[PDB]
Amino acid sequence: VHLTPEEKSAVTALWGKVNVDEVGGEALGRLLVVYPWTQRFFESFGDLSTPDAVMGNPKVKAHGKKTLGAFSDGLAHLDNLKGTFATLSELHCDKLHVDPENFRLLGNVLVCVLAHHFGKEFTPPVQAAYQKVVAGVANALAHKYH
Amino acid sequence: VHLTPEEKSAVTALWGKVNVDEVGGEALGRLLVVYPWTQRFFESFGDLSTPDAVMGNPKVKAHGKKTLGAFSDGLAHLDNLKGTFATLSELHCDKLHVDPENFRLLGNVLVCVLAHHFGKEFTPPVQAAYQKVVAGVANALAHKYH
Amino acid sequence: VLSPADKTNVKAAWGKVGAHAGEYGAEALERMFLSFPTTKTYFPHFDLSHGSAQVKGHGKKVADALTNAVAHVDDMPNALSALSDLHAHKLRVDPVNFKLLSHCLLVTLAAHLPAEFTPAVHASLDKFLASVSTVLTSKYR
Amino acid sequence: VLSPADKTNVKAAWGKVGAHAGEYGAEALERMFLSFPTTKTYFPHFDLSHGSAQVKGHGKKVADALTNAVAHVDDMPNALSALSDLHAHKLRVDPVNFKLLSHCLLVTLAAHLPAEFTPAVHASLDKFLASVSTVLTSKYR
Numbered sequence: 208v209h210l211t212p213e214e215k216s217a218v219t220a221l222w223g224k225v226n227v228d229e230v231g232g233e234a235l236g237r238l239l240v241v242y243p244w245t246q247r248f249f250e251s252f253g254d255l256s257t258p259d260a261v262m263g264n265p266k267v268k269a270h271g272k273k274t275l276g277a278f279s280d281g282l283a284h285l286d287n288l289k290g291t292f293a294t295l296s297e298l299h300c301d302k303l304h305v306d307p308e309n310f311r312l313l314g315n316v317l318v319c320v321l322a323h324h325f326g327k328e329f330t331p332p333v334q335a336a337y338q339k340v341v342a343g344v345a346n347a348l349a350h351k352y353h
Numbered sequence: 354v355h356l357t358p359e360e361k362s363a364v365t366a367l368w369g370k371v372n373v374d375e376v377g378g379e380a381l382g383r384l385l386v387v388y389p390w391t392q393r394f395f396e397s398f399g400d401l402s403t404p405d406a407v408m409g410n411p412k413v414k415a416h417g418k419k420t421l422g423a424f425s426d427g428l429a430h431l432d433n434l435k436g437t438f439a440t441l442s443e444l445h446c447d448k449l450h451v452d453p454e455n456f457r458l459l460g461n462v463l464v465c466v467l468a469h470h471f472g473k474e475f476t477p478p479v480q481a482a483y484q485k486v487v488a489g490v491a492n493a494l495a496h497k498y499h
Numbered sequence: 500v501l502s503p504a505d506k507t508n509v510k511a512a513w514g515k516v517g518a519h520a521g522e523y524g525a526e527a528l529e530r531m532f533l534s535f536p537t538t539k540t541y542f543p544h545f546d547l548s549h550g551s552a553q554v555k556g557h558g559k560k561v562a563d564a565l566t567n568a569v570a571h572v573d574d575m576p577n578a579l580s581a582l583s584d585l586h587a588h589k590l591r592v593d594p595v596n597f598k599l600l601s602h603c604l605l606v607t608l609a610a611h612l613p614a615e616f617t618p619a620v621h622a623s624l625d626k627f628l629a630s631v632s633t634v635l636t637s638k639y640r
Numbered sequence: 641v642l643s644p645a646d647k648t649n650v651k652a653a654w655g656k657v658g659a660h661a662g663e664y665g666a667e668a669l670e671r672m673f674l675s676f677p678t679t680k681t682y683f684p685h686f687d688l689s690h691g692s693a694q695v696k697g698h699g700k701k702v703a704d705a706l707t708n709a710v711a712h713v714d715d716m717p718n719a720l721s722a723l724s725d726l727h728a729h730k731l732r733v734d735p736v737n738f739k740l741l742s743h744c745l746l747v748t749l750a751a752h753l754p755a756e757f758t759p760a761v762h763a764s765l766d767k768f769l770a771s772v773s774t775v776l777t778s779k780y781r
């Protein structure tokens with residue numbers, strides 16, 4: 208992605224304050240509550256029946272953590288999102304059968320969680336930078352679909 | 354865009370049969386009838402009251418041939434769409450104020466018009482090839498937006 | 500919302516489909532799978548090669564449901580009821596994909612109905628597939 | 641469809657907004673123009689700089705319309721009637737844009753309501769914002 212000097216520093220400074228453990232568990236839990244059809248990929252997680260159920264589900268929590276950690280490695284290679292996520296891309300297509308559209312939804316929920324967590328620190332210009340990041344991460348994940 | 358050799362040949366072989374003026378007017382016309390909001394830019398064109406009005410509008414027909422002419426010349430530069438449409442992209446953004454979403458709509462309308470005009474020769478693999486071309490052009494036309 | 504003119508337009512065009520609805524439904528799907536490859540993520544369990552029995556069957560299922568929607572156009576929600584529940588609770592197809600199938604059904608139809616696919620019928624058809632899609636998606640959340 | 645638990649969540653969250661509604665309205669817009677540059681093509685007449693009064697003024701209108709939407713949650717199509725005629729016949733904003741404002745509105749809410757922006761309230765607001773969007777574009781065609 209193309210980020211201005213101001214945008215790169217915005218993204219980077221905020222990420223430093225994030226605990227992946229908990230921002231991950233939140234973003235995934237919220238994906239499963241707000242867009243219930245995404246629950247189709249997680250039948251083995253168990254009870255995703257109530258907002259309280261999804262949020263307290265430990266499998267959701269472990270998974271959200273796994274996802275965000277991979278996401279974290281990408282920030283470090285913002286210059287080549289495509290090359291970085293190629294392996295995971297093939298995996299999500301060939302073995303998992305995840306419609307890439309889901310990537311976009313996750314991106315949007317993550318922005319929401321950053322806003323909620325940080326409040327007024329998460330300003331318009333910070334948002335915009337993070338919108339570019341997520342969109343580029345989503346395109347990187349969908350890249351090897353065929 | 355990324356087209357295999359066989360995809361370009363298909364594209365170029367069919368296009369060879371196209372009456373640009375004829376299809377230009379028809380596609381622009383259908384856009385204006387199927388997605389009426391797109392009429393916002395064309396107030397100076399005159400009577401746009403009915404489907405017949407639109408389809409018979411000389412202003413629409415002339416806009417359509419200029420539009421598709423430009424498309425037509427881009428087909429010679431499938432390897433460098435961005436370079437070819439960069440200036441046009443700037444005009445659309447800075448002076449005409451056109452939401453790039455309009456470009457995605459015309460693309461789809463265009464594909465419906467070739468299907469209507471070519472019947473069975475517009476096969477599934479020929480569609481596919483053309484779907485890339487159209488997406489390619491719309492992306493290129495939106496690339497200088499800011 | 501569909502006007503009366505729209506309903507006349509849809510019933511007329513779908514009339515001509517008549518007996519080919521099932522073959523049209525197969526061609527639209529095959530066009531979807533080829534132009535929009537991500538839609539294949541929902542058919543991992545299908546043999547998606549051209550002419551497969553699975554596609555032709557499914558194609559026929561999809562067309563029957565459109566015909567039904569055409570017959571009960573003044574009351575779509577009630578007619579597609581069972582179909583909304585299935586897509587909402589079981590299949591769980593992301594709403595974006597309905598748009599891509601809608602588009603390939605329109606390309607199918609343009610290609611087969613030269614005479615009838617006027618500007619005004621095209622608009623009515625497109626509004627019609629948008630309502631069907633809205634119905635099919637209405638119980639997602 | 642908005643459930644009774646939905647309607648409660650919305651009334652409650654929009655209750656907290658209170659007199660800041662105008663202010664949240666404006667930030668949401670600002671969030672939109674910066675994250676989604678294409679939306680600016682509809683305000684070629686406005687000064688889009690930060691602190692712009694024009695943005696502020698429009699932010700207030702938007703926010704008041706939604707306060708109106710919340711008041712009439714069971715009769716939305718009648719409350720928003722004039723607004724839906726307006727965008728369909730005059731403004732003519734492409735439907736995709738309502739999703740982009742809706743998301744910026746959501747992010748503005750999240751950032752201002754740390755205690756109220758629960759997973760469930762998040763879900764009812766997103767539902768509520770899709771219904772306002774559906775009403776506002778219902779007359780496009």
Ligand code: HEM
Nearest residue numbers: 245248249273274275277278295303305309310313345348
């Ligand atoms: C956009 C960011 C995403 C990233 C970076 C990501 C990354 C990952 C990683 C690192 C794994 C683990 C593979 C392993 O541990 O061997 C994985 C597995 C998985 N992902 Fe994704 N993912 C993302 C989004 C999604 C979304 C939105 C969905 C579906 C809604 C999804 C569905 C899955 C599933 C079903 C698994 C397998 C879990 C299991 O074994 O039960 N992912 N993903």
Ligand code: HEM
Nearest residue numbers: 391394419420421423424441444449451455456459490494
């Ligand atoms: C393949 C997609 C398109 C291409 C290649 C295209 C190309 C062009 C060209 C070559 C011109 C004249 C530029 C000049 O003055 O040098 C133009 C102008 C214009 N375009 Fe586009 N265009 C496309 C799509 C659209 C769409 C979808 C809309 C609106 C719905 C639109 C609205 C306009 C208008 C309003 C003008 C100005 C006409 C005038 O001033 O008489 N264009 N376009």
Ligand code: HEM
Nearest residue numbers: 538541542557560561564565590592596597600601631632
């Ligand atoms: C115009 C819209 C659509 C119609 C009318 C429709 C109708 C149907 C019907 C009639 C069935 C079979 C029902 C049965 O056997 O009880 C079905 C199943 C299914 N549909 Fe939909 N559908 C539509 C859109 C979609 C889209 C867009 C997709 C995915 C991109 C999709 C994915 C599926 C799947 C995966 C099944 C089950 C296939 C199988 O295992 O046989 N549907 N649909």
Ligand code: HEM
Nearest residue numbers: 679682683698701702705706723731733737738741772773
């Ligand atoms: C929740 C969604 C929205 C609501 C409630 C809303 C509501 C309104 C209201 C109440 C007005 C002023 C009408 C009047 O009193 O004259 C208005 C005007 C306007 N809206 Fe919408 N709108 C929405 C979404 C959008 C979006 C997404 C766009 C474009 C991206 C848009 C573009 C405009 C424009 C250009 C005007 C006129 C501005 C002016 O010249 O002052 N609207 N809107």
